[PDB]
């Protein structure tokens, strides 16, 4: 469509050159701007991409959106605006014909549980034979096709393009993880949600938000930004076991569905039975109480699966049909996965990376420890360290603790492991600068009948190293390789 | 329409009795429930209206929405829901066919300036010969027809009904004052806004919000609740002279128009000339700079009128035509009105009732004081007193200060005036339990050529007294009557 039409949407602009040209692309990354692209320049944490306008011109781009007039050949049109990224979201949603309005969109936010819930919703939709897309930490997925990405909630143009890809692939719904960063930074501007789901609010990301108050307020935006049009069928799904839900009710007019285990709620889990092979519980609902069998491990995953079921139910699918679908749902990659159960030890991977997440992981696994719990965890580089010793304390619930860096980036890895060590409550721990070395050590220490847990990465396939360089790393593969060496078994070679 | 259709909108409900009946009315006030009404019961600060269901049944109402099953005759249908008021807003907007979606809606929030801006927008629309409605502290107005009300932002059902009245009267737009109370309490659930306008955030209402942080976050809801549908033409108008605007930008994706006097902004006022008869200024805009003549007094009203002009402009009216309309706009009742200029004193009424508002009032009037400034102010009963001595300090910018109660309700009036007195910085003040007595005293003290200001009530026609009883009271009429007695003039009698 033509640039004229697109920029009618923008009231304050200084236009230098013609808007007659056809536009089929928008990008905030100069490296992909071409003839027919709009390149929107912006100020990042690393570079100001206004510096790259000449590059995009060389590549044939004839239209740039900028905060200040640039030095460029006269045949490149410049649109000067006060807020380039705000305009990028307007342009992108317009160009792609409002992709978020074209399918059912589910959004999940919370300190822990975003990937779990979002993936469970996706997997339920697929079990119901519906085309479904997912975007989050585990990347972008349309039905069974997966590609990895750099963020949980990617920057606005990339994100909008992916919603448009889901629409074009024929998705009936798409579920997005909604990071508090993404909300505050405008990455989700223009993304209309139909159902908003909350897991919990516990201490994290204060390097970015400064305070718990600001952090909670950031997550509330997913709920208030649903808007005020009561002719729309929109719904909010809240966790009554988290006290922040009381506040969330006040910021949106749409009907609220509550779930709970400890606290009274509209949907509850009772008579919970746990195993390393999944759970059963009685699912109390406003319409009746029904037996549920779930393949997921732990009470925290009962909260998560209830959130997922209620979200799908809210848009018109019968609970009976959802409960049937949940029974043999596939694993959520990296989230409490029991590896090769034929081993003479329990070998579990999990993504726990905050104190609360670790407590929930250990709560779930500990009842099944026959002998000793061997627990490896990493601390992420370049993140707030204030709750790191607390993570070290929680880890010392285990019998033997291994501390490692996780994505140390430019941080000294020994500083990360030493910070974890400051919280230890017993002397049975060890620190490794190299996480792979730490994993092999965990297997060295493990006896038949022991339980080994590798926490904070799941199957995340890299360590972010100095210069922010990704080096290949797989907890699961390193763990298994070390385990087969020690105990035997494993596929032929 | 029939109750069945209405309640299809509510997913969690326990229905006792038939929904076949016709519904033409909804009410949260039992006193107006009749056959064909839905009565929604709720828990207020004073009474739980669930107690009144039998009354509504006696009056012929056959449908109640309740949080718990009630004792009622079997022929009354009960719909039991978890959140009655949330359902009231859903039912009301549905029943009245989404009245806020049917005209352009402007919403104004801020500590001071809501009535001023909202009224200015209304008056501009009328000057442009467009049907316009206004709802706020000065009541409900459709074109020139006014009725008074109990709140700035009335409870959800009454508010929705008034939007529906504006639609039915043929209004092309309606402007609502948006109180932080109204936002938090859900009074505006279902009210879609097209333009949101911010004035300022200064200390007020902490008896309700507890903190400035929570208070600011409450006002941010007007902006985030605009939603995320970028196919809609919605706009945000922010004051760059207020530091809270930086935060407000982050909570909405829509284009932001900024105004400013002290700080750089897209729309600014320069070369400001002031009189008691209005102002002139050069209005810098993104499209050019234009001379503006405004009948309103003071720099604070220049901020307000710029906000009003930009809001109307944003929905497609030319600035030139708006600027012409502003020239002889009518007064905003109670807000810096110069009374009978034929008097040998300046006699001014104004609604200033916080420290910041008082400073802005005194800033506006002081350059025109030839001799002495005689300044009367009241403190509201049953409100947070923490900034009351500060109000007393600000008042002592005047030469002679009179302290009175304003709507003391059940508070001891002497406690209110004494709290004001604690901030005084000179000895030239006096306190009166009776505000009318204080006004007459102000005139007693005034010499020809003096300036008398009566602040905090405007033309508000009552004092709220013990038992929360309204007794007639008019600052303007009492002031004028006393002034004519002392100085002569005034209409024959
Ligand atoms: C601090 C931050 O925000 N940098 C994000 C930001 O970089 P920069 O601003 O530095 O980019 P830069 O300045 O290079 O470029 C600015 C702009 O210029 C463009 N430009 C750049 C170069 C060029 O040649 N041409 C060009 O046009 C570029 O496309 C961009 O539009 O823009 C990128 C692109 O959009 C994101 O990819 C980055 O995200 C990183 C990966 C991140 O780690 N971000 C974190 C802070 C984050 O967003 N986290 C949340 C939550 C997830 C999370 O935090 N998870 C935990 C997990 C912990 C357990 C791990 N085992 C954690 O990481 O702590 C999320 O991803 O949604
Ligand atoms: C504390 C509060 O919120 N009580 C509001 C609230 O009463 P209650 O909860 O006590 O009502 P109650 O408990 O009696 O009844 C509950 C429910 O039962 C129903 N019910 C009641 C009786 C009955 O016979 N039958 C029946 O069905 C009734 O309709 C209601 O649905 O419900 C009313 C109806 O909806 C409002 O009219 C009240 O608002 C008062 C007037 C107020 O003063 N409210 C203030 C707190 C307020 O809302 N302020 C903002 C901002 C304006 C402001 O604060 N301005 C300053 C001005 C200062 C300068 C003045 N010169 C100030 O006042 O400080 C605003 O109005 O939007
Ligand atoms: N609802 C929950 N409450 C507490 N901890 C949880 C919850 N869900 C998952 N976790 C823990 O946190 C880790 C991260 O879960 P995930 O669903 O990836 O959260 P997020 O996507 O918000 O980071 C899991 O591997 C598990 O240890
Ligand atoms: N923009 C402003 N900034 C500061 N004070 C103002 C502003 N506008 C009005 N005031 C002062 O506050 C009083 C109340 O103004 P009004 O527009 O009624 O505000 P609100 O409706 O928010 O209470 C006025 O009479 C004036 O003294
Ligand atoms: Mg998080
Ligand atoms: Mg995630
Ligand atoms: Mg106020
Ligand atoms: Mg007002």
Residue numbers in the entry:
A (entry chain A), B (entry chain A): 1 to 493
Sentences from the paper on this structure:
Here we determined the x-ray crystal structure of Staphylococcus aureus MurE UDP-N-acetylmuramoyl-l-alanyl-d-glutamate:meso-2,6-diaminopimelate ligase (MurE) (E.C. 6.3.2.7) at 1.8 Å resolution in the presence of ADP and the reaction product, UDP-MurNAc-l-Ala-γ-d-Glu-l-Lys. Although the two structures in this study do not differ substantially, as assessed by comparison of r.m.s.d. values between them, inspection of the ATP-binding site of the product co-crystallization complex shows that two side chains take on a different conformation. These side chains, Phe-300 and Lys-360, are both in the vicinity of the binding site for the adenine ring of ATP. As with the E. coli and M. tuberculosis MurE structures, as well as those of the preceding enzyme in the pathway MurD, a specific lysine residue (Lys-219) is post-translationally modified to N-carboxylated lysine within the active site region and is thought to be required for positioning of the Mg2+-ATP complex.
The resulting enol-pyruvoyl-UDP-N-acetylglucosamine is reduced with NADPH by MurB, yielding UDP-N-acetylmuramic acid (UDP-MurNAc). Domain 1 extends from residues 1 to 98 encompassing the uridine nucleoside-binding site of the UDP-MurNAc-tripeptide product, domain 2 extends from residues 99 to 332 and encompasses most of the rest of the UDP-MurNAc-tripeptide-binding pocket, and finally, domain 3 extends from residues 333 to 493, with the ATP-binding site formed between domains 2 and 3.
